[PDB]
Amino acid sequence: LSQDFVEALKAVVGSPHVSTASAVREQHGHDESMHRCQPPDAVVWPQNVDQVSRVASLCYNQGVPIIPFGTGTGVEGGVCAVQGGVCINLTHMDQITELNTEDFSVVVEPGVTRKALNTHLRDSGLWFPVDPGADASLCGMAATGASGTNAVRYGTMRDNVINLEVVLPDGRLLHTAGRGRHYRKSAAGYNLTGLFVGSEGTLGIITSTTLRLHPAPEATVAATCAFPSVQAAVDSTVQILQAAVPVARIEFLDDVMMDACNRHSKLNCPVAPTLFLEFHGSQQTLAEQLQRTEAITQDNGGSHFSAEKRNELWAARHNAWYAALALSPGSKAYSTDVCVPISRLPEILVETKEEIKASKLTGAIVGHVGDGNFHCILLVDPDDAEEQRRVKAFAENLGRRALALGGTCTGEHGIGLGKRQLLQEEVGPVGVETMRQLKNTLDPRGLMNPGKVL
Ligand SMILES: Cc1cc2nc3c(=O)[nH]c(=O)nc-3n(C[C@H](O)[C@H](O)[C@H](O)COP(=O)(O)OP(=O)(O)OC[C@H]3O[C@@H](n4cnc5c(N)ncnc54)[C@H](O)[C@@H]3O)c2cc1C
Ligand SMILES: [Mn+2]
């Protein structure tokens, strides 16, 4: 990157907020994925939307790639600077604006995490429900299309994003539903907001997100239930869903994952395939829901069901990724993320469990089985290229299996670098060309996070 160009960057954001130091670039060259660190040529920290626009326009017109960077917790290599360029760390824009408790909405900048938002909402009766395990940027969650354990009841980011402020690749400012607008539904024109949710930084830079807030539940009960087999746990899950019990959370852990979480959290659950469950409602709803759910799990061989213990339960779940890595310190990991029609979920989870067992790989299974969806967390020796090939082969084959079942190769993590071939198979030639046309119209020079998604 030329010195005159670095100077121009410093004129916009100030010298403390531009760095070409190799250690800074290396920290921003990777995420939580196993994709090899690819350092940007520079990291830039804009202080407001005008500066984001000016940095984008400078990079775009000079032919310099732009990589938006939130909290760097992605798991598909989205922030890897595969073509070099300028990494734009957005987290100094960290303000909550426009809290509208009477409309159940809020506007947040990229430096606001879900925990920061809910802390600011303590005492209001409202909360934001979409809960990835990491304390991620909410605008980053909008960019990846994130979901979480609460999504089965409260929806994904796509369900809860009302409006987006986006700096387009050439610096133009777009408010996807109109500046300052927020409403529960619209038929006005084409839905631009939904195009940018799940775009992973390839269509523009999200500089604020308008989010739907939800009422705190009247009462909450959490429970665990252990099963003799994966099949029993997942059959129970499908029957709970088909009975339309409005569970707030329904998470599956296999025996390997349960053991890992036990050792990482001072939970001490029976080592067995397990459901973590949560119910929201009044005492009457809760009593009724608990009895219908216990009846269903009992029929499939579930054990008997088992506020600070609730926090430890979900803290252990949210840290399952780190619990899995701790089984073999020094390993990295790859995660699958398929989502299938729920009637096919028993087939593919039992099959995945059998394939993990039959192979020499170490893997644990956890996920949002309420949301078509589960993760296979596969461990990899960072210095064993053969094991890396086999893990990648395993992930690819699981992906194709989900696609054969009418599902999708990713329920929530996104495509980044890892799933680009699976995406092509998932939507076919016309779908690929259509997505390419959308990318080309918004990013003609192809400088917006190149090499990702498509
Ligand atoms: C322990 C753990 C648990 C997790 N659990 C979940 C889970 O349950 N569900 C889930 O969906 N994910 C989960 N994640 C993954 C990750 O937290 C989410 O994908 C999250 O949305 C990433 O946000 P980020 O800001 O950290 O992303 P980054 O890694 O910084 O960026 C991810 C991608 O989005 C782009 N991007 C980031 N910010 C912006 C922006 N403002 N505008 C435009 N593009 C942008 C980047 O260029 C990149 O392509 C988990 C991760 C960890 C480590
Ligand atoms: Mn998840």
UniProtKB/Swiss-Prot annotation:
Its main location: mitochondrion. Gene3D superfamilies: 3.30.465.10, 3.30.70.2190, 3.30.70.2740, Uridine Diphospho-n-acetylenolpyruvylglucosamine Reductase, domain 2, Vanillyl-alcohol Oxidase, Chain A, domain 4. Residues 36-216 form the FAD-binding PCMH-type domain. Its EC number is 1.1.2.4. The keyword Oxidoreductase applies. Its cofactor is FAD. GO terms for biological process: ATP biosynthetic process; lactate catabolic process. GO terms for cellular component: mitochondrial inner membrane; mitochondrion. Readily detected in liver and kidney, with a weaker signal observed in heart, skeletal muscle, stomach, brain, and lung. Pfam families: FAD-oxidase_C, FAD_binding_4. It is an enzyme of class 1 (oxidoreductase). The keyword S-adenosyl-L-methionine does not apply. GO terms for molecular function: D-lactate dehydrogenase (cytochrome) activity; D-lactate dehydrogenase activity; FAD binding. The modification N6-acetyllysine is found at K10, K266, K392, K419. Interacts with CSRP3. This is Probable D-lactate dehydrogenase, mitochondrial. It comes from Mus musculus. The lineage of its organism: Eukaryota, Metazoa, Chordata, Craniata, Vertebrata. The gene is Ldhd.
